[PDB]
Symmetry: C2
Subunit: 220 residues, 2 copies
């Protein structure tokens, strides 16, 4: 039973978490919701809605639908302005190329909407509508809800239990475990080995190259 | 014996670690040296020399000096984005109020320090501070913390080092100081503890709220 692959995008295949953080920071500052950047970095990988609720509750207050919407817009705009900073992570393309050449099926699964996802894909010189990908616009709920991964397993014709989830955030690992998939964590999104293991990572690697070099430990 | 306090600055009292990461990345790309952000982030808190050195393993002197200057210019451009971390001002004032001595100790030079101190509204010449310009080596070498203890006239052994990075924690243990880790630099609790942190708090407000677990 050959392994099928569900990849997170931002922080996992492209070096874009820190741009995402900066974009949220600028949006939140614009809206007088001053939050230290480590707290924003902690939530990267959740869909914006859940992230906003989450930061909200942890600061003791709550954010209306209307401001959530504006924060979202501000975030997309700030991200766009940072689009050319985004580079593919080491091994990322080579890993994807390895899988195709090997007939292993993979899908991308991101809490980002079509906009962010199109930007990061450029860095991997990939055309969105030419690959297997699921976005926040494809489901009701983002990470850590299992929705995205389930839709991804479905898009590639693999049972979710024949799947390996690859992610850089607590939220990817959490969602992986919630649908009982096998989760593997990458350090390239800035989360540490401790956090990723506690959120359910079975193995943790530096980046796609490191993972590629150990593909046997973890995939068939 | 009352506790004396040695604070890291960048990421401990000010929320500047991400600007620091971003200035390093700007400087690296200008020199066409590819490097993932997380790798840069892992190093913030070492001296620029150790940093770049350590980076290569994972760079000419000529090249190194261009990067140091490029980083300093890029970091300046980002100064307006930097603000105090919650509780940082209150914590320092609480220490003053209680006549507890403190000193700031940073691996950066006077230029980055000054920028960071502005967010605390501190006068660099009106406070106890030690920078990379006052010692031979930056963190994790114990030099700065030793300088800092000397500047406030306290045994390093009766000092709390408060930092956000693995390099702070390492240096603290290397001079037998008690180390406390803050999450506000983006390092995790596991990292900070494995580098020697005795306690780990979220930020200066969390620390101030738990000050009794940790300080006499
Ligand atoms: Ca991610
Ligand atoms: Ca981290
Ligand atoms: Ca620091």
């Amino acid at each position: 039973p050959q392994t099928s692959f569900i990849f997170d995008l931002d922080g996992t295949l492209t070096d874009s978490v820190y741009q995402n953080v900066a974009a949220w920071k600028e949006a939140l500052d614009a809206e007088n919701i001053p939050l230290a950047m480590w707290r924003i970095h902690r939530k990267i990988g959740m869909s914006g809605g859940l992230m906003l609720k989450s930061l909200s509750r942890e600061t003791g207050m709550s954010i209306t639908d209307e401001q959530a919407e504006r924060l979202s817009e501000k975030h997309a705009q700030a991200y766009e302005r940072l689009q050319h900073q985004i580079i593919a992570l080491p091994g990322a393309v080579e890993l994807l190329e390895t899988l195709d050449k090997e007939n292993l099926k993979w899908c991308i699964a991101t809490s980002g909407g079509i906009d962010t996802a199109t930007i990061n894909l450029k860095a991997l010189k990939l055309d969105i509508n030419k690959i297997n990908i699921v976005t926040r616009d494809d489901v009701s709920y983002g990470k850590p809800d299992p929705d995205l991964f389930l839709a991804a397993a479905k898009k590639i014709g693999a049972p979710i239990d024949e799947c390996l989830v690859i992610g850089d955030a607590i939220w990817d690992m959490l969602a992986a475990r919630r649908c009982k998939a096998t989760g593997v964590g990458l350090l390239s999104g800035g989360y540490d080995i401790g956090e990723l293991e506690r959120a359910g990572a079975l193995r943790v690697y530096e980046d796609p190259l490191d993972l590629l070099n150990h593909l046997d430990e973890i995939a068939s």
